[PDB]
Design a binder for these strands. Structure first.
Ligand SMILES: [Mg+2]
Ligand SMILES: [Mg+2]
Ligand SMILES: [Mg+2]
Ligand SMILES: [Mg+2]
Ligand SMILES: [Mg+2]
Ligand SMILES: [Mg+2]
Ligand SMILES: [Mg+2]
Ligand SMILES: [Mg+2]
Ligand SMILES: [Mg+2]
Ligand SMILES: [Mg+2]
Ligand SMILES: [Mg+2]
Ligand SMILES: [Mg+2]
Ligand SMILES: [Mg+2]
Ligand SMILES: [Mg+2]
Ligand SMILES: [Mg+2]
Ligand SMILES: [Mg+2]
Ligand SMILES: [Mg+2]
Ligand SMILES: [Mg+2]
Ligand SMILES: [Mg+2]
Ligand SMILES: [Mg+2]
Ligand SMILES: [Mg+2]
Ligand SMILES: [Mg+2]
Ligand SMILES: [Mg+2]
Ligand SMILES: [Mg+2]
Lengths: 278, 152, 121, 140, 155, 121
RNA sequence: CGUGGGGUAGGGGGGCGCGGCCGUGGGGCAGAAGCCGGGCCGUGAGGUCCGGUGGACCCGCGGCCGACGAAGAUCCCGGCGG
RNA sequence: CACGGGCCGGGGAGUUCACGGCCGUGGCGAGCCUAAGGGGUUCAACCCCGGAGGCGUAGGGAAACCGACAGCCCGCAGCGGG
RNA sequence: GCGGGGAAAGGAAACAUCUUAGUACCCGCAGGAAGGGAAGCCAACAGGGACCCCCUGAGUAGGGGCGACCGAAAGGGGGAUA
């Protein structure tokens, strides 16, 4: 049924890393293995970096705001070309006391910008809904591969397994202090520390515009629903994002347009996933 | 999705930007006028290539009249072969009432208002349609069905 | 009342254009642990007559009385954090209040006690 | 310094000969005008260009005929493969028989001392220890 | 949940017999009469009433009967009555100068034809489209570019 | 024009490599012919409707489609069909007529020489 | 493998640089950018390192976007010559 | 002995939208896509809803009006036989 | 925002009908919005049900040296509802 998804190319092409197992491991809030649950169909999608990049660029581009110059910039002085015969170039010049001073033309100081940004420019790269959801499924499946997650840059040495599923009881944790303990016992804290230490002051004019800090991404926490206490308990950690499962998107699933995000699923979130993005 | 470099990138350092040195990049005179003009004098050779000889018809002139669309039926026909596919799907979901021992479909609730005769009917069918072509009535009747003409 | 905007230009414009009653908030300095248990508050705006310990800079570790506060500059002058000019006069280094710790509080002002009760609560 | 096999040894010597005879590729009249004095090569698309047309007595244009042997292209003159290093941990995975260490220009003196010590212990040829580091280690 | 009236979309000649339903402006007086209400009482219960409509649809009657029972048994809360809740008439200045008297209304075309077909409405509508470059005013001469291109590409 | 680049889909790219390797290993020109049709520009890729199989295939025939099998028309023959991809409606029609739907690598493994296999585009 | 190697207009294919953004990895008061001179690498666009000057920011790699590359326009503005 | 530039620095020219043709890829496929707008959000992002409508599935004719294939041959690839 | 007066340049590769454009501009008069608004309506024998604005119908019908070019309405989906 999914033979066309996981394409077997044996014997002529050597196999890659095996598909994720038919079951997922579930850990309790103390980091102890608890049980197994059936793998949702989403994790069997092939990882498709080309499609994931397209869907990420689409979601990011919907955020950009229109920019432009003032419509009359450099065009409102009283100027005219004074013709030939005066020994000077025939560009427009100030009419009054500043007379010979050049004006209007893009090559003159204080002149108009020839081809400035326009607020009507289409910045949003649109994507079909079906194509966007196929990319989301592809990005979800990448969270189950240590090869993809490590290649994105996460610290995965101490994580017991991937996909990392924790019990639904974790959704009751309300304090950042307790969520910190949960991250440490699941082997996720080293990646949070990578983001905490990796925050830098970025180079260039972005500092002037409120973009002084560039922060790495660490962990995506997926919960069953909105307004569970765990959302507030983890959202203050450096590089951590948290969403309910129905709010999954390409911005959190493939930062940089690159698949494989270190993700902590709750068991209830994995259950709800089976009816979404399909 | 594949991305390609803009042509302006290649044209930096080329003086003419692909417009040549002799016939450079000028204003509307380089197009022989502004807009869709010139087709009877200097672009008449373009009319003769694509249009009717002698009259240049589609480019210039009148032909016939238009029957007013507000008093004309907009037809949405369906072929007999395509209909046979449709009822098969409809039966699987259970949308077909086999009212009289035969499958009964009426085209208007299906969004069509005419029945044409292309294809093959493989089942007996009662079809309620405002209009059916001669071959549609025959092909439906050869399969044990029947066409019933309703009045608009 | 100091902007809520996250834009650095608006944060800085709030700071430089703040009226006098807002500039007082920039005079807050941490109380020493001893004063914190006696008064029950963590911070107070520095006041002339207070005694502060300087924690940063060339005069780090120097304790002295506050002799003058400049709301416009948001700077304070502290006894001991001085030097001499070429003409031999004694001049004061202007110290930012966030770099000192209050070790003795001047409480002769009734109006100041109201601020303490508000923060102790 | 780096020990190369005989096929590459000849190509390295050949590359040195090609370097000595390589023209300095300049635009026409680059020597006359200060405004273009420090310019890179430009292949100007002009009517009367005599460099593009390869007139004898004029400067020579850029062509792929001037490319150096592909097997030694990019090597340091000593024969090594240069690697830019910014911290001591960057020395991992390099082979002193193949690689030479070039320290990043902006690496500060404190970090440069750690890199040079670790690299010299591992046997790497360090291209640019710097004047200050050389004095400090010599003083040591 | 207060029901919404269901009415039939007018069947045009162009449709060829295909019909569909739509949400109506309000319940008809015939439908209200079958549930024992007049226009005033139905409006006091928060129902949209359309005294212009002549048709009576049984599905509308059935929805009204079901919801009225819920309301009269305390299970449903009627919304606010569908009658005016404010009166806001502003003092008028210069009616004659702005063409708002009967003489002005006649010259503007508002006595003989609809507002949408008056010449000043046409002037304002097209001016807005050109200012915003909306719909067909993003391209001048769009029709002729399409016409000539169709001939060339469909020859 | 922007000249043809080949597929960006790595799944398609790996399949094309597979078919070329299978053609070399088994001396089978068919898998080379399939790979060339699969690598066609997207705007001229091969799509085949199940209704076309009625005319071009007999009962029991083994058919390889170097492209997508779409479900249009009706199938009345029992066919073994391999394709790059199959739509759900096409899948249902082929199976319900008693046929079988394979991947191209499945067909190559089953029939390395591609004997009796009919190319349908 | 080629009795392959000139080329204006023009068409086609690949790369360099500049400003920002999304990621990733780093450097910096034991001295960032900039600037003067110099060595090395690349056919080249250019990269990189050294000494001096300077005093706080900047860079590698992958992706994406442009207010993106000047020798010339009796070019514009400023400065300054014979 | 055709015209332009004294010099240096800085600035300085294919842009955006709509519509059409075509190409390179990507999704879905006898179907494809939603528009305005609506609900939620960690609030211009994002998730979900919205199929009105547009294009395609059938053409001919000014219009009334009418309304469609697996039969034979040649034959590239490919497959089979010698 | 409402009423009135009202061009030309340019385009049509000339130009006058035409367009540009009921635009620029001028004169008068309002509000925090204005104007519109409660069927001498639309439809076609089936039915909608005041109005304005948004998406569509649609560059369709239609106007036009039937040239350049100009260009609806009903209907459908919404905001809101008296
Ligand atoms: Mg300006
Ligand atoms: Mg774009
Ligand atoms: Mg900079
Ligand atoms: Mg030309
Ligand atoms: Mg000529
Ligand atoms: Mg010219
Ligand atoms: Mg003629
Ligand atoms: Mg006639
Ligand atoms: Mg010449
Ligand atoms: Mg330096
Ligand atoms: Mg128009
Ligand atoms: Mg050549
Ligand atoms: Mg980059
Ligand atoms: Mg030039
Ligand atoms: Mg000058
Ligand atoms: Mg002089
Ligand atoms: Mg001349
Ligand atoms: Mg001169
Ligand atoms: Mg104009
Ligand atoms: Mg003219
Ligand atoms: Mg004229
Ligand atoms: Mg109002
Ligand atoms: Mg009013
Ligand atoms: Mg008009």
């Amino acid at each position: 049924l999914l033979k066309f998804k996981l394409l077997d190319l044996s014997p002529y092409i050597k196999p890659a890393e095996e598909r994720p197992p038919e079951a997922l491991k579930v850990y309790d809030v103390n980091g102890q293995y608890m049980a197994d649950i059936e793998t949702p169909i989403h994790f069997y999608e092939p990882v498709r970096p080309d499609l994931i990049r397209r869907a990420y660029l689409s979601a990011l581009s919907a955020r950009f705001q229109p920019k432009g110059v003032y419509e009359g910039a450099g065009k409102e002085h009283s100027c005219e070309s004074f013709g030939v015969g005066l020994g000077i170039a025939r560009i427009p010049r100030y009419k009054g006391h500043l007379w010979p001073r050049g004006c209007f033309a893009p090559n003159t100081r204080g002149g108009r910008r020839a081809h400035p940004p326009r607020p009507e420019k289409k910045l949003h790269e649109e994507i079909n809904w079906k194509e966007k959801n196929l990319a989301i499924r592809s990005a979800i499946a990448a969270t189950a591969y240590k090869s993809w997650v490590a290649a994105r840059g996460h610290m995965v040495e101490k994580v017991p397994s991937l996909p990392l599923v924790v019990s639904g009881d974790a959704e009751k944790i309300a304090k950042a202090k307790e969520a910190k303990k949960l991250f440490e016992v699941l082997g996720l804290w080293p990646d949070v520390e990578r983001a905490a230490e990796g925050v830098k002051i970025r180079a260039g004019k972005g500092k002037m515009r409120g973009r002084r800090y560039k922060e790495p991404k660490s962990v995506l926490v997926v919960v069953s629903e909105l307004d569970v206490p765990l959302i507030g308990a983890v959202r203050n950690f450096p590089g951590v994002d948290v969403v309910p499962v129905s709010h999954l998107n390409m911005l959190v699933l493939a930062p940089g347009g690159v698949p494989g995000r270190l993700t902590l699923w709750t068991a209830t979130a994995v259950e709800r996933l089976k009816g979404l993005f399909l | 999705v594949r991305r390609f470099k803009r042509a302006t990138k290649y044209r930096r350092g080329s003086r003419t930007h692909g417009w040549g040195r002799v016939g450079q990049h000028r204003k509307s005179g380089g197009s022989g006028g502004k807009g869709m003009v010139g087709f009877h004098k200097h672009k008449w050779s373009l009319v003769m290539k694509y249009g009717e000889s002698g009259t240049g018809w589609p480019f210039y002139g009148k032909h016939g009249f238009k029957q007013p669309e507000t008093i004309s039926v907009e037809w949405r026909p369906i072929n007999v072969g395509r209909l046979a596919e449709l009822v098969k799907e409809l039966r699987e979901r259970g949308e077909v009432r086999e009212e009289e021992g035969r499958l009964v479909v009426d085209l208007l609730k299906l969004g069509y208002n005419k029945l044409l005769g292309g294809g093959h009917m493989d089942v007996p069918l009662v079809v309620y349609t405002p209009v059916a072509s001669k071959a549609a009535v025959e092909k439906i009747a050869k399969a044990g069905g029947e066409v019933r003409i309703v009045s608009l | 009342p100091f902007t809520a905007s996250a834009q650095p230009r608006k944060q800085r414009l709030s700071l430089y254009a703040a009226p006098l009653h807002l500039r007082r908030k920039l005079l807050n300095a941490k109380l020493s642990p001893e004063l914190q248990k006696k008064l029950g508050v963590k911070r107070l705006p520095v006041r002339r007559g207070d005694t502060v310990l300087i924690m940063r800079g060339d005069f780090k570790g120097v304790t002295g009385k506050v002799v003058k506060v400049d709301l416009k500059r948001v700077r304070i002058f502290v006894e001991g954090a001085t030097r001499t000019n070429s003409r031999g006069q004694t001049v004061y280094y202007p110290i930012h209040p966030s770099k000192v710790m209050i070790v003795d509080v001047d409480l002769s002002d009734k109006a100041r006690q109201k601020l303490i009760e508000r923060r102790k609560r | 310094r780096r020990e190369l096999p005989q096929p590459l040894k000849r190509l390295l010597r050949l590359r040195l000969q090609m370097k000595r005879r390589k023209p300095e590729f300049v635009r026409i009249d680059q020597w006359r005008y200060k405004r273009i004095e420090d310019s890179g090569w430009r292949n100007q698309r002009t009517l009367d260009n005599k460099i593009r047309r390869k007139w004898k007595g004029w400067p020579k244009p850029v062509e792929v005929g001037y490319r150096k042997p592909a097997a030694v292209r990019g090597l340091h003159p000593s024969g090594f493969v240069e690697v830019l290093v910014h911290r001591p941990e960057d020395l991992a995975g390099l082979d002193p028989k193949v690689h030479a260490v070039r320290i990043g220009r902006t690496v500060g003196l404190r970090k440069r001392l750690e890199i040079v010590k670790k690299a010299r212990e591992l046997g790497f040829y360090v291209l640019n220890p710097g004047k200050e580091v050389v004095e400090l280690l010599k003083k040591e | 949940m207060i029901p919404k009236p269901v009415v039939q979309v007018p069947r045009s000649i162009k449709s060829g017999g295909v019909t569909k339903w739509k949400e109506g402006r309000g319940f008809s007086l015939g439908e209200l009469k079958e549930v024992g209400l007049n226009a005033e009482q139905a409006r006091l219960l928060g129902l949209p009433v359309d005294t212009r409509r002549d048709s009576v649809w049984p599905q509308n009657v059935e929805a009204l009967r079901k919801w009225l029972i819920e309301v009269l048994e305390g299970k449903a809360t009627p919304p606010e009555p569908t009658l005016p809740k404010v009166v806001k008439v502003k003092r008028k200045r210069g009616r004659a100068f702005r063409g708002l008297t009967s003489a002005g209304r006649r010259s503007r075309g508002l006595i003989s034809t609809r507002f949408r077909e008056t010449h000043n409405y046409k002037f304002k509508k097209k001016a807005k489209e050109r200012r915003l470059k909306k719909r067909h005013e993003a391209t001048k001469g769009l029709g002729n570019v399409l016409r000539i291109s169709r001939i060339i590409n469909e020859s | 024009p922007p000249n043809p680049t080949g597929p960006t889909n790595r799944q398609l790219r790996m399949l094309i490599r597979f078919l070329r390797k299978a053609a070399t290993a088994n001396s089978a020109n068919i898998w080379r012919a399939i790979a060339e049709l699969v690598e066609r520009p997207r705007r001229s890729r091969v799509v085949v409707n199940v209704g076309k199989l009625n005319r071009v295939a007999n009962d029991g025939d083994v058919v390889v489609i170097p492209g997508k099998l779409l479900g249009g028309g009706e199938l009345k023959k029992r066919v073994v069909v391999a394709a790059v991809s199959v739509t759900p409606k096409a899948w249902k029609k082929v199976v319900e007529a008693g046929g079988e739907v394979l991947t191209i690598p499945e067909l190559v493994r089953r029939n390395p020489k591609g004997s009796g296999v009919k190319i349908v585009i």
